[PDB]
Each structure stands twice: as C-alpha cells, then as structure tokens.
Amino acid sequence: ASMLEAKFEEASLFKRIIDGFKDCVQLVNFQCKEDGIIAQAVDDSRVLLVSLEIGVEAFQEYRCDHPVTLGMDLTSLSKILRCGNNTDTLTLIADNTPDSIILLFEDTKKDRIAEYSLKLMDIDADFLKIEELQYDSTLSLPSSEFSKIVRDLSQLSDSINIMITKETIKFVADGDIGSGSVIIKPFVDMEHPETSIKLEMDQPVDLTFGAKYLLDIIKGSSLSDRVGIRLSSEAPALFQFDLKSGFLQFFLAPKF
Amino acid sequence: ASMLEAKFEEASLFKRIIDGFKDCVQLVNFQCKEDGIIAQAVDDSRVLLVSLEIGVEAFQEYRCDHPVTLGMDLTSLSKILRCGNNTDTLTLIADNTPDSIILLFEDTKKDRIAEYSLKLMDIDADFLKIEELQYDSTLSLPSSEFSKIVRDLSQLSDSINIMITKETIKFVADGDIGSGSVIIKPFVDMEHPETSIKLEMDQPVDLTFGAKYLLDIIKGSSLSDRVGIRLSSEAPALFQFDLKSGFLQFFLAPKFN
Amino acid sequence: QLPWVEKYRPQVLSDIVGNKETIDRLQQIAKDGNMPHMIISGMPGIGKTTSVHCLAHELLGRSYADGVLELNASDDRGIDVVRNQIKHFAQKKLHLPPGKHKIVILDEADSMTAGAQQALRRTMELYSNSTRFAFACNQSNKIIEPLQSRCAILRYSKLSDEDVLKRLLQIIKLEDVKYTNDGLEAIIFTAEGDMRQAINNLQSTVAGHGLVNADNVFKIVDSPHPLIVKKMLLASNLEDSIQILRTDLWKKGYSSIDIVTTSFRVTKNLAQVKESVRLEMIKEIGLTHMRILEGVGTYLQLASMLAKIHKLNNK
Amino acid sequence: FRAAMLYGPPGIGKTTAAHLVAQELGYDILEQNASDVRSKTLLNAGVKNALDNMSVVGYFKHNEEAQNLNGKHFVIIMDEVDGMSGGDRGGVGQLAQFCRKTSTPLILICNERNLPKMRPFDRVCLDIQFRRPDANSIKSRLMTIAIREKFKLDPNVIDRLIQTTRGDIRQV
Amino acid sequence: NLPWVEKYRPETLDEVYGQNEVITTVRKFVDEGKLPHLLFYGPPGTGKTSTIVALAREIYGKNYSNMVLELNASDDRGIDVVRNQIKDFASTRQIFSKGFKLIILDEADAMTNAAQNALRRVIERYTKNTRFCVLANYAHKLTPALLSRCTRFRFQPLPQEAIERRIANVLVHEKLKLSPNAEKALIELSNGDMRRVLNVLQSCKATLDNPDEDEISDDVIYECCGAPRPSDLKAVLKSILEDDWGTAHYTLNKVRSAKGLALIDLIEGIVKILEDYELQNEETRVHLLTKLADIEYSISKGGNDQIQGSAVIGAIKASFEN
Ligand SMILES: Nc1ncnc2c1ncn2[C@@H]1O[C@H](COP(=O)(O)OP(=O)(O)OP(O)(O)=S)[C@@H](O)[C@H]1O
Ligand SMILES: Nc1ncnc2c1ncn2[C@@H]1O[C@H](COP(=O)(O)OP(=O)(O)OP(O)(O)=S)[C@@H](O)[C@H]1O
Ligand SMILES: Nc1ncnc2c1ncn2[C@@H]1O[C@H](COP(=O)(O)OP(=O)(O)OP(O)(O)=S)[C@@H](O)[C@H]1O
Ligand SMILES: [Mg+2]
C-alpha cells in the first residue's frame, strides 16, 4: 500500500495554492503530518517568508502514519498541475524512501487516470522559527481592493509607505513622475460583509515596504476574497489569506 | 487657493481621450481657457498633428479663472489615469504658478479618495493657427469599417493610396508580395444610421499616406463610431472624431509624387 | 562615534579654506545667479564635492530638494539612464528666482563611459535655459572633447601647509583637545595636502592616545619615523646606513613602498643639504621607487638606493 | 551626391552653419541627435517613414505667399553620427542606406570622418571638411563680443587665449 | 585528507599566534559594540582571513551563513557586481536580525579605480546599516579615499616564537619527528609565512615517511621547496672569488643546472652572504650593490640567463680589486 494518501475536494484548489507563492519561491519542502500539511520558505533575498498550512478539513481522505518531508520544485509542480481539468480529483500518494511523488488525476464518470511522477529535490534547509504573536495594528479588507491599490501605486515608485493613524489607513508613494496618496476609512456594510473594512488600532504605525515583494504578495489573491494585515514597528508585517482549512501568510521586512 | 477646478462626470472619458493619441504624441501642452480645454501637438517626425478640443459642456464643474498652459507627458498621464476604477469622479487642480497638477479620484458612496500629483514638463509651444479651408472631398464613415480597412491594407505595403472618383472611394496598396484594393460605394441605411457612408465631393482626388500614421490614427476609433474625413489635393488630410462636447482632429500630410 | 570628516564638513562656501580665487569666483556666481556648466578637476581630498554642494545649496536655498539631481558612482549611469532620467529632469517645470536654475551634479565623471558622456551634449546644450551641469572629476583628461568644450574648467590646486594648519587649529579649538607643535607638524607632514586624511589622522590620534604628539602620530599612521629616515639618509659611512636600514626598518616588517615614500618626503624637506644634491637624491629615490613598483621589492634595491645616495652625497 | 557630411574639430560651427543654411532657404528642419535611440528598427519606423513626406508644420505655418516652393519639404539633420554607441546596433548601416534611396536633403554631422566606423559613407555622401578658424576672425568676434559687453581687453591676452584654446570658439 | 593549511586553521580568536596587538584591540572593539569598517592589510600567510572569519563566527554564532557575505577578487567584477550585489546586500534588510550585516572582501587590492570609487561610495551611503572589512596585501594599491573611511591594521609577519609553537602543535597532532636543524632551516626559509610552512610540512610527510617515524633533515626540506643551500652558496662564492674564469663559470653553470635554481635566489643569497664581510673599501660595496641591483632588475624582465650569469660573475670579480 502507501504510507501517505491525501485526496482533495477539487483540482482548482492546489492550483491556486501553488500559484500563490510561485513567483517568490523556487524550491519548497512540504511537511506532511497527522494534522495536515505545512510548509514554509524564504526568498533568495531573505525578505519574504511564506508559510502555508492546510488541515484535514479541506481533504476528504487523509492518511499519514508518520510525518514525511517532500522537497520539490514549484515550477515543475505547476507545469504538472497545469494539465489538470477542473473536474478531476488529486490524490497524492507516497511510499517508503521518498524519491518520486505521484500525482493522479481521476474522474468519477469517465475513466481518465492521469498519473505523473515528480522527483524530489532535497535541500534539508527547514529553519522554522516563529516568535512574534503580538502586533501593533490589525486590519481586514477585500483582497481585490488591496491588489488594485498595490498595482496602482507600484508604477510610481519602489517603496510604498503604509501608515495607520486614527481610523485613517493611508498608502503613500513618492517618485520622479509624481506622488500618490490613497486614504481609506473603516465602515461596516450590512448588505455585503465581504466589502467591509475592519480595523483595530493600539498605537499609530508608519513603515515602508518594497514594491516587488508587495506585488509578489498580492499574487495570492486567488485563495480568498478578504485579506488580513498585521503591522508592528521593528517587527515583520503579516499578510494573511485565510482558507477553509488553513492559511497562507507572508512575513515581510520593512525598509529604511 | 487654486486657479482651475475641473470635474469630469465619468473617469473613463479622459482615459479614453488620452489613450486615443498617446501613441503619436509624447509631450503635449494643454491650454485651459474659460471656454474649455484646447491642446495641439506635432509628432516627433513632424508628420501627424493632433488637436483636441473639449468644451465646457463636458465638465461637471469648471472655473478656469484665467487661461493657463499645462505641459505634461502622455505616458505618465496614462499611467496615473489607469489607477481609477469605473465608478469614480475625476478632479483636476492647478495651483497658482503651478509646478505640478493634482488629480483626485472620488467615489460616489464611499470615503475612498485617491489623490495623485503629476510634475509638469516645460514645452516650447510653437502654436500654429489653423484656418478653415474648402476641402475638395468631405465624407464620414463608420470608424470600425475604416479601422478594418486600414489594418487590412497596411499589412501588404507601407503606403496606402486613397482615391475619390465618381462617387467611389478606393483604397489601394501596392506591396512586394502583391497588391490590394478596396472599393466603397455610398449608401444610406434607415434602420441603422450608424452604418451609412456619407459623401460630399467637389473634384476627384488622389492622395498617398503612410501605413504607420494610419494605424496610429485609427486607434482613436473608440471615442466615436463615425469618423469624418476631409481630403484636398494640396492640403493634409483631416481625420475627425466628434466628442459629445468637442472633437479630436488628426492632420496627416500626404506623400510626394 | 562620528567621523570628524563628516561632522565638520563645511556647509557654507565661506568655511572652505583653500584656493581663494576659485572660492571667490564661486561666491560671486552664487551671489549673482548666472552659473554656467562647469567641470571641477583636482587631486583627491581638497574639497571638490563639498564645494559644488555648498554652491548648489547657496544657489537654491529652500529648493535644493526639488532642483538638484546628484549622480555618484553608486547610482547607475548608462545609456538608458542618461537618455531617460536626465532628460526628463531637464524638461521638468520649476518656478525659481530669475537668476537661479536647476542643477545636475555628476560626481566622478571620469568613470562614466564614453558612450554615456556622448548622449549628454545635446541634453545640456538645448536646455541651457533651465539646467546647468556640474561635473566633478579627478582627471580632466578622461572627459571627451565636446564636453570639455561645452563647460568651463575649474582646477583645484593642492592644499598648502598654512590652510591645513588653520583648519586643524579651528578643529582643535572647537573640540578642546591637547596638542603640541610637533604633533601638528607631523600631521601636516603625513597629510601631504589631504585635508580629509589630515582630519582623519587627527581624530584617530585623539581617540587613541588623547595627546597629539609626534610619537603618537607616527605610531598611529604606521609609517617609518622621519627622524630615523633622515638619520639613514645622512650617515657618513654607507655601512651604518645599511645597518640602520637592515635592523631598524627592514626587520620591523615595513613595506618597501612605505620606506621609499618616507625617504622621498624627508629628502624634500631636508633644508640642511643644498638644492642640487636634494634634486639628485630625489631622482635616485624615484628611480628606486619605479623599480620597486615594477614587481621587485627586493632589499637589494633599497641597498643600492642607499649606496647611490651615499656616493652622490660624498662626491 | 544625395547626402552631405559635415566634420571637423569640436566647436567650430558645424551644427550652427548647418541649421542656418537649412533655415535660410525656407526648408523645414528635422533634427536627430545622439540623445535619441537611433537603432535599426527605430530608424526603420521613425525616420524612414518621414523620408518622402511633407511638413505639416511647414504647411500650416505659411504656404499662401509665393516665398519658396520647398517650404513643404524636409532637411534631415543627423547630428553626432560618430556618437552612436553600443546601444545603437546597425545604426551606421541603416544611415548609410538612408544616404541613398532618399528624396530629401540629408545632412550628417560628425567629428572624426576618417574613423573606421564611418566607412560605409565612403562615396555615397558629399563630405566637406570644416577646419579650425583663423586667429583673425576669432579676434574680431571676441572684440565684437567685448564691445557689446562693455569691457576692454589687451590684444595680447586675446591671442594667448586663442593659443590656449587651440581654436575652439565655444571655448573662448 | 583536508590540507594542513585548512585543517590547522584557527577556528576562533585565541588560536591565532603572533598578532596579540591587533587581537586585544579587535576584542575590545567587539566588546564595546563600536565595530567600524576594518582594513586588514599585510603580507600573505599571516592570518588575516582566519582572524576575520573567526571574529565573524564569534559575533554571529549560527547566523554566520546568513549575516556574512564573503567576496573575492576580480571574479568578473568589472563594475556590475559592486553595483548590484554589494549594494543590495547593504540595502536589503534581514528578516530576524538585530544588528548589522558584514561583507568581507578578500585581496580587494586588485580592483580598478572605478570599482574602488563605486565601493567607497557604497560604503559611504550605507555606513549605518552594515559594516565592511577589506583584506589587502599592499595598502598602497588602494585609493587614498578608501583608506580614510575605515581603520587600518597591519599584520606584521609572525616572529620565531609563534612559528615554533605552531610547529610544536602540528607535531602533537601528527606522528612526525623533526631534526633540531630542521626547524632552523624552516624558520630561515619561511620569512614569517605560516602558509608555506604548513605547505612544506605535509609534502615532506607524504614523501619521506615509509614507516611514519623517520627524521626530516635539511636536505629534503631544501630540496622540496626549491631553495638554495648555504654550503653550495658559499662554494659558488669562493669559486667566483678565487678561481679563474673557466672554472668559476663551469661551477656556476653546474650548480644552477644540476639543482634547478634561479638567478634571483642566487643573487639575493650572494648579497646576503656579502652583507657581513669586512671589506676595506666602500667604493667596492657601492659598485657591488649597484651592479647586483641592475642585474636583478634586468633579470626581472626575462633576458638570456647565461649573459646575466656571466655579468654577475664579472661584477663580483671586478668589484673585489680594491
Ligand atoms: N578646503 C577645505 N576646507 C575645509 N575642509 C575641507 C576642505 N577640503 C576638504 N575638506 C574636508 O574633507 C572632507 C572630504 O572632502 P571631499 O570634498 O569630500 O573630497 P573630494 O574633494 O570630493 O575628493 P574626492 O571625492 O576623494 S575625488 C570634507 O567633508 C571636509 O570636511
Ligand atoms: N564660427 C563661429 N562663429 C561664432 N560663434 C561660433 C562659431 N562656431 C561656433 N560658435 C559658437 O559655438 C556654439 C556652438 O557651436 P556648434 O557649431 O553647435 O558646435 P559643433 O560644431 O556642433 O561642435 P560639437 O557638435 O560640439 S562636436 C554656437 O552657439 C556659438 O556660440
Ligand atoms: N597566525 C596563524 N596561526 C596559525 N595558523 C595560521 C596563522 N596564519 C595563517 N595560518 C595558517 O595558514 C592558513 C591560511 O591563512 P590565511 O588567513 O588565509 O592567510 P592570510 O593572512 O589571509 O593571507 P592570504 O590568505 O595569503 S591573502 C590558515 O588556514 C592556517 O592554517
Ligand atoms: Mg567627492
């Protein structure tokens, strides 16, 4: 048989999960345990720290007796996942001495068994260290508007200054062709909760981020429809996209 | 403490206006007077002249105390105007002796206000006055058909010959791989007036234009569905796109014999 | 900590001590306003960048943040940069007083490629009504001929002993440090006209030994002592000179380049001997320096240099 | 010869004389310099199409009075041809091809004509040589500038300035 | 199987010998937390790289691989690398660091003037967020502006005590026995270079030890590293001094051919032996030094070795006639 068997509900979920951190990470090692799958990685510039977690709620059949490490490339993994239709179901199967992971796309009415092998590139560089749990300011807003503002202010400069004063969220950019300031305020929409802006403030904050890393972050907007942001001075900012059984979070480092 | 305050009712109008000719003009002066906005600019090769008039009937609010000149690049303007969504109002502001210009994007039912600044570019304006001439041929045709004809003929050669003879339009192109010809006859359609070709002529004419200039001009076919064409044997062709409160004119000079 | 070469940097054009006529001309330019394109050339560390910085500051007042574009060796200066950014900055609109103008300060212009310097001629010629260029280079020979023809050349001479001494006096007066005349003379000797190096050596001596004395200066500079070098270059017999060079200077691990440079700088100030013998000893020391620099720093070369110096001082 | 090629030492009057000759005969100037990207594709798209066209500026400026029949034409001034760096691939060959197959005056300006890079312009263009001006003309021009600027200079200082400048008028 | 040059490398600060004057200062500097840019310059085979890597380790612990950027010589660094890589490393903020990043450039004296200017400007722009360390063999080949930005430290070659201590240490960790005159020959041929000592020791170990317990003599250590012999040198000198032209020339050729020595070593050894002679005339010494320096400078440019050898013989003979 197999030690590891993990089945998904659909095929378009792992697609967007891999598309999330496909532009800032080259290789990644997934840790498969009894409580689900976890992963984390850092970019080559050591600025953005991606952390993925998915429990046993998004899966339908999950069986892993002992935790296993699967270190694989993300580009070839996406090339493999590109061949999957939106009506198939992925079944990750893994055996002893992990050297090749087998993906299997299967349909439930027509016999379409698409099997694909993928070698495992072992890096043995895990370095999982998370210490901060208390942030200075927290907010939640639709990911679409965040991505819009980001890719609108990214053309003007490479450094975007996010500053949270009293109930006024402010994104600033200043360059050679001009300047740009986006000021938004929280509000609760009863007709649509998904278009609301929630904010909790303890102290006024003001700090800058890089446009490239922020553009790499906003690429994970296909996972959910609402993004959470946690800012704290002398602390890496947290950009979280929730998921029915987990989350994808980016830890970003400010600039000078 | 601002000279001019202009308020576009839709944010997409100015975006389309700038996108109509952002491919043939790099630097441009905008002359803001009490009647509206007037802006003319020559091409880099001095072959295509672009003129734009937006009357006061297109601004929701428009003060413009005294006439001013705002020189700005079209690339940065198109980069700034691209940010705004569809459901926003745009406001242009210029301070006394302006070193920059302020563009405000506001929402109708939300407090989200997006303000941008654009640094003006100094331009030595060689303002040339254009006088009305009696064009030998004057017609108007659907902009979609004209753009299709231009894109179809420009693939064979780098020169398109337009001949108006005996209530007959002829677009011909003689290239290396072969030749191409398109014949147009005037007619009216009662059920769809937007698909009727108008024709008014005095003498038969024959002119030759470049392919790149026509391909650049036809890109402004998103402002109006019917484009007007004025041709003369000794005058540059005039291609006009009418806007609900003004117009956009392209003066293109023909080639030699 | 804070480097004294950065804390006591002149912020006004009057605080710069050195070439008086060029500074007077720059003061007159800043007072009038009509500033032309200028290439500032000169030896390193005599106040070239600081001069143009104070000039731009005094010219633009509160507009230094908007009407000054500085490009050093850290920024990228290629064909694309010169064609796009400098051009878009020159055409940038700015309301200034009738005399003032925008300023583009290019530091270390001798490092810019010829192709990049080529695309600046028309840029600086067509927009001469609202943009003035200020290049700062060490060698005016690496700048192409059209550029050198378009702008005025301002040469900066090496700093004299009096000006560096006055600057050090002002620094020690404002810093409240203990010193002696011998230490100041040693600093002037080891500085050879480098104000920045002089201030750095003074700060190092103060932070290391407190009292500025010749012994501490020559201990912190890690160079051969001028006294023992003069003793080596003035012995009556060649054997004593060779012994002094062997036991006192070669055994201590001194670099041959440093020994030759110290002998050169000592022979220049040896006011005891005559002029012709000084010039000839300097010629011999320079020949030995050229021999050392060509890949052979053998002790035999220094021995032959001492032998020739002795034979010339006895003949 | 279709094209003219101006060359000589820097700052002697090449560009000035070219512009003034083009503007005296009523022509329209289309000038391109080293500060513009003159690659093969950009020259094929930008300037090549304007080879045999007529100026809209020259037309809409003045065309009713019988002043000259060439005001609707082009004088294409390619300045600083020797300055096409490595970021301009094929520019010399395309400009040599433009030196033929043309219909409008094309004036090329450079500094060193005998450079191997300018070889394709061997016989296809009329190359005249601008030399360093004589000292007398420079002295007269400097005296005129001085009498207009209200200051008097010793004629020895003027000669010494002419000697140190090596003939550069912009430099003096 | 790792080399003694790499196996006996000091892994921390206390294992470098003969450099206490700089070790105490750098220890005080890293204890006060005021570590500036450091320019470690000196002759090769002294311990600059080992000292700086040991200091970086002692400062950063396990964060060495993430907080230390080791850069080398030309490595195709025209202007591009100093402009992009170093600038980003000085501008890119770490994710979980409390302090400053360190970039150490080895033998950076081979950089061009433009590269040195770019480097000094980069150091000036980011002097607050990171610290720089530059290694060098000759401090004169660097721009005088780069020197005035950092603090210099000269590494004077190791004295006899440090070298003999290291010989003792390498004899503890290896089954070798060394002759009393062997260490004397080693210290005379080393010129204060530990790298060459550790290179020559492993060679003799590999070649000589059949039962791994032999004694290393002066013969093998003179033969392996290709160095002259004092007895042979004195014999050549005496043959040049006393015998006639044919015999002296033949002896010189036989010595320089049967042993594989170069004229540079012969000349320097001959002048070293002549340094202590009680010659009567000073013009003798003057002419000798001048002509020998001329011969050495001409040999430095690769001439016909036989002609320079005959010229050496002629100069030595003609100088000793007063
Ligand atoms: N004439 C001067 N008077 C006073 N201080 C001076 C003078 N010249 C130099 N300095 C000092 O030296 C420091 C460094 O000089 P810089 O002007 O930066 O060197 P530089 O002239 O630009 O030459 P480079 O940059 O090495 S090619 C300044 O910040 C001043 O503190
Ligand atoms: N013959 C001249 N008489 C008077 N002024 C002159 C003369 N030649 C040049 N000048 C001056 O020099 C300025 C620029 O001369 P240009 O002809 O543009 O230089 P150039 O010949 O193009 O050489 P380049 O392009 O820099 S290599 C003019 O604006 C005049 O002020
Ligand atoms: N002071 C020392 N004590 C002990 N071993 C040393 C010492 N200096 C050098 N070594 C040995 O020599 C090896 C090379 O030393 P390095 O530090 O690389 O020399 P360096 O001073 O950096 O000069 P280079 O590398 O030739 S430019 C080390 O790995 C040690 O094995
Ligand atoms: Mg400087």
Ligand SMILES: [Mg+2]
């Ligand atoms: Mg010119």
Ligand SMILES: [Mg+2]
């Ligand atoms: Mg080393």
